[PDB]
Amino acid sequence: SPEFISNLSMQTHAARMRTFMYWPSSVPVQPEQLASAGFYYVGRNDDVKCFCCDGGLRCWESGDDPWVEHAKWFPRCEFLIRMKGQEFVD
């Protein structure tokens, strides 16, 4: 768990997975990929947010990798760096 937290209620993988209960199954990215990469569903469209950095992303397409998208849009996220390392984030 990172020092910095934007949504303490979503600190656990289990809480983040729980938000995907009503995730549209037509979206081509799996809930476990998103939750593992720090993301939870905010309940509208395919909108998600990271529990650590509060970074928000939508319009998930086939082939999107949540870790790669996390590092390109929110490269200074503390959770991202603790999980994947400085070396993974361009």
Partner: peptide, 4 residues
Amino acid sequence: ARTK
């Protein structure tokens, strides 16, 4: 994916 894009930012909101």
